[PDB]
Amino acid sequence: DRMVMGKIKRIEAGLPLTTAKGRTFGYDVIDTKLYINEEEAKQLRLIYDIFEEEQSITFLQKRLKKLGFKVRTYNRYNNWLTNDLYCGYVSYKDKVHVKGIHEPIISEEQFYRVQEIFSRMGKNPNMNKESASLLNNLVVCSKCGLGFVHRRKDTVSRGKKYHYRYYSCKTYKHTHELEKCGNKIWRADKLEELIIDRVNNYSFASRNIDKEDESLNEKLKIEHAKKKRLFDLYINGSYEVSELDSMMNDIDAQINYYEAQIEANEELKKNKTVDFNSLEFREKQLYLKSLINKIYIDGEQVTIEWLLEHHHHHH
DNA sequence: GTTTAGTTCCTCGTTTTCTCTCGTTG
DNA sequence: CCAACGAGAGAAAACGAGGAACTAAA
Ligand SMILES: [Ca+2]
Ligand SMILES: [Ca+2]
Ligand SMILES: [Ca+2]
Ligand SMILES: [Zn+2]
Ligand SMILES: [Zn+2]
Ligand SMILES: [Zn+2]
């Protein structure tokens, strides 16, 4: 017990909890504290970068190998890309969480960016399988609520072989574990070009502005308001006859700077991923995942629930 | 000629689960 | 050595969107 209260105290003091041998990659253990291991520290930076690129531990393992790096087990890399020990923190099973006394090896940002990658990879099962379909994990059934799965079916007659790609609710694949819901079964090629269509339109739409949202001409006005507030001021208390001209002429050469600026800034404006279809496959689905949250399907009608809103005003 | 469907096994990255062992603590 | 125990490393089993055949209706 009292020893336990001690371990806790040791952690709250900023010291590392796990100090076992070879369970501290990128850190050497001296005394009971850990200090950066230049060598392994480098590998973590490389790992952390590559991963942030590929967004796949396996993909990572494949690359590392090619680079002549000794490759470790999947879970080991999963731990290193997770676990804030590498970005500075020390923890104690939910009871204690605080910045430790060791040199972090990863930026608190690049950390939480990677943690972001795992977050999404979570909500999108198999999105990294080579068989991941363009609209993977994006389509849901308005009937029964489960989501759609991509299906394929092929048969031949004579010598001609037939292939077909659909997107059916799960109730139409797991016939045994659940009964049908009556919602449509879509032709992949369609649903897709359909969605791609709204996505291009939507994309094109965003980008363009409201006049209210777009000073070099709004200050041109400030001076006009000065010559106002100034003259009338003179009629009351104000300034002396002379203090008036020494000033009113300033805002004028000030006007001319702006009028020449404005009329001139005119001419040089008078005389003056958006391409989805070009993106490789994986990048396409990723693009979608970033731009679309959910595609609801109701028989014949589909409703895209965008993720990113637009800049302009709506009604 | 074309599709729509049901069985009955695969795939293969990511996730869980579950022992082994380390080792700091008063 | 006491006693308690959190959690990486590893091995192995579980997940789950998708797949390949072949067969029998529509
Ligand atoms: Ca102490
Ligand atoms: Ca942790
Ligand atoms: Ca159009
Ligand atoms: Zn359904
Ligand atoms: Zn808009
Ligand atoms: Zn309005």
Author numbering: 134 to 347, 350 to 407, 418 to 460
Sentences from the paper on this structure:
The large serine recombinases (LSRs) are DNA-rearranging enzymes that are members of the serine recombinase superfamily. Many LSRs are bacteriophage integrases (often referred to as serine integrases) whose function is to integrate the phage genome into a host chromosome by using short specific DNA sequences, or ‘attachment sites’, in the virus (attP) and in the host (attB). During the integration reaction, LSRs bind to attP and attB as dimers, mediate association of the sites to form a tetrameric synaptic complex and catalyze strand exchange to generate an integrated prophage and new attachment sites, attL and attR. The LSRs share a catalytic domain with the smaller resolvase/invertase enzymes, and there is a strong consensus that the LSRs use the same mechanism of strand exchange.
We crystallized the LI integrase CTD (residues 133–452) bound to a 26-bp A118 attP half-site and determined the structure using anomalous scattering data from selenomethionine-substituted protein and intrinsically bound Zn ions. The integrase CTD is composed of two structural domains: a mixed α/β ‘recombinase domain’ (RD) and a zinc-nucleated domain (ZD) containing an embedded CC motif that extends away from the RD and the DNA. The construct used for crystallization contains part of the helix (αE) that connects the N-terminal catalytic domain (NTD) and RD and is involved in formation of the subunit rotation interface during strand exchange. Together with αE, residues in the integrase CTD make contiguous contact with the entire attP half-site via alternating major and minor groove interactions. The four independent complexes in the asymmetric unit of the crystal are similar everywhere except in the CC motifs, which adopt distinct trajectories. For LI integrase, zinc is coordinated by Cys274 and Cys277, positioned in the β10–β11 turn, and Cys302 and Cys314 positioned in the loop between β12 and αJ. The zinc-coordinating strands form a continuous β-sheet, with β11–β12 engaging the DNA major groove. At the end of the ZD motif, the side chains of Tyr295 and Tyr297 from β12 lie on the surface created by the 5-methyl groups of T24, T23 and T22. From αH, Tyr207 contacts the 5-methyl group of T11, and Asn208 forms a network of hydrogen bonds to the A-T base pairs involving T9 and T10. In addition, the Met136 side chain from αE intercalates between the G0 and T1 bases in all four int–DNA complexes in the asymmetric unit.
